[PDB]
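step 3/5: co-fold with adenosine-5'-triphosphate
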Amino acid sequence: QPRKKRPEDFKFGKILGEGSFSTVVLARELATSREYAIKILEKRHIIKENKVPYVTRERDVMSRLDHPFFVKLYFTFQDDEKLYFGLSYAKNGELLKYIRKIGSFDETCTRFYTAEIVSALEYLHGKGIIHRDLKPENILLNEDMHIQITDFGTAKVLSPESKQARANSFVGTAQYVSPELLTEKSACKSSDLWALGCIIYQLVAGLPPFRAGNEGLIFAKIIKLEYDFPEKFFPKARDLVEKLLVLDATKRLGCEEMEGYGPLKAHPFFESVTWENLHQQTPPKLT
Ligand SMILES: Nc1ncnc2c1ncn2[C@@H]1O[C@H](COP(=O)(O)OP(=O)(O)OP(=O)(O)O)[C@@H](O)[C@H]1O
Ligand SMILES: O=C(O)[C@@H]1CCC(=O)N(CCc2ccc(Cl)cc2)[C@H]1c1ccccc1Cl
Ligand code: NA
Ligand code: NA
Ligand code: NA
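step 4/5: write tokens
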């Protein structure tokens, strides 16, 4: 392995963002001149806030990933005060920023970005991992405008030894949380497909489908499947969303009980998509 890195091996630049318990800084490694986004956590805070399992989970999960549509974890290190994660830098930031600025994506852009998310989930689920907090804030964009999914401290590696399907930790974001987590108190891979349906809806409509000024109101709508489509919504995309936003998690297109990603990739909304080539394709410009 390469020499373990230390803070003094880098020059830090701007803060890229600040979370409730972490700060991400842009950094240049002196010996190479490479750029990294380094996520830095104060140990005393992680302890106070009961976040040790989160930090451990983030490292363990990201260490297993090796796919172009995910933020890469290159290294970790620590000192007396802090934990450090050396991540790929996604220069163009959050997908959410683009939704806010443009309001709606056109059909070509919706299809392209949805296809990348589907490709990423196929990989993640193939490794028996549930994301559990999939949302536009956690889909970053690299310099070439391909996706880089992030935020794995609330992900779950399902145990292959027990053929585990359900995860019991209560994690997520209200607009994207699945009805099974609310009613049955567990999530499954298909919970991410529910989140996918909410995201596709959001790209086209400009708002996620279950929305309210507080969480409990959103929960009430999710479990009733209470949402509507705006009058103009690409029809094949509406069909796809209606096949993802299904209360019964065993009936969502793409889930294991529905025979997996093949039928999802075969949906008519994706007819023009070349799946094998996506990360090397030039993304359509977002206008
Ligand atoms: N790999 C990266 N490249 C570029 N920006 C990043 C990267 N990882 C995280 N960020 C940005 O850094 C900011 C802080 O991220 P961080 O994980 O610390 O908190 P968060 O996910 O925004 O909030 P919370 O963790 O409280 O839910 C976020 O806005 C994120 O968009
Ligand atoms: O578990 C691991 O893979 C490593 C191994 C080295 C190590 O001791 N740690 C961190 C242990 C830890 C976690 C949280 C706090 Cl608040 C303090 C110590 C883990 C760690 C080191 C650096 C950066 C992140 C992490 Cl999770
Ligand atoms: Na996040
Ligand atoms: Na985060
Ligand atoms: Na959340």
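step 5/5: annotate
The domain at 1-93 is CATH 3.30.200.20 (Phosphorylase Kinase; domain 1).
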